[PDB]
Amino acid sequence: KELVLVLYDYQEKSPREVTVKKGDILTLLNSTNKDWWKVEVDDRQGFIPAAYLKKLD
């Protein structure tokens, strides 16, 4: 499972849409939308703009 790094502080906009903190590492559940990657934080999922995220292989 790929790891991504939350480059920036991001709060939600809709229900079940990740509210990530900075410097966090995540589980790239789905990178099939060029602008909207679906991440996995702790034991919760959601989506986060893909410009707030980075590659961790």
CB 47 within 8 A of CB 36: yes
Q: What's the one-letter identity of residue 36? A: W
Residue with tokens 């991504």: 4
Q: CA 22, 28, 33 angle in degrees (round to 5)?
A: 105
Method of structure determination: X-ray
Indicate the DSSP class of residue 56: E
Q: Topology of domain 1-57, per CATH?
A: SH3 type barrels. (2.30.30)
Q: Which helix (H) or strand (E) segment is 40 a member of?
A: strand 36-41
Q: Could you give the 3-state DSSP secondary structure of residue 16?
A: coil
Burial of 56 (0-12, 13-18, 19+ CB in 10 A): exposed
- Region of 6 (left: φ > 0; alpha: ψ -120 to 50; beta: rest) is beta
Identify which of 40, 32, 35 has the alpha carbon closest to the alpha carbon of residue 16: 40
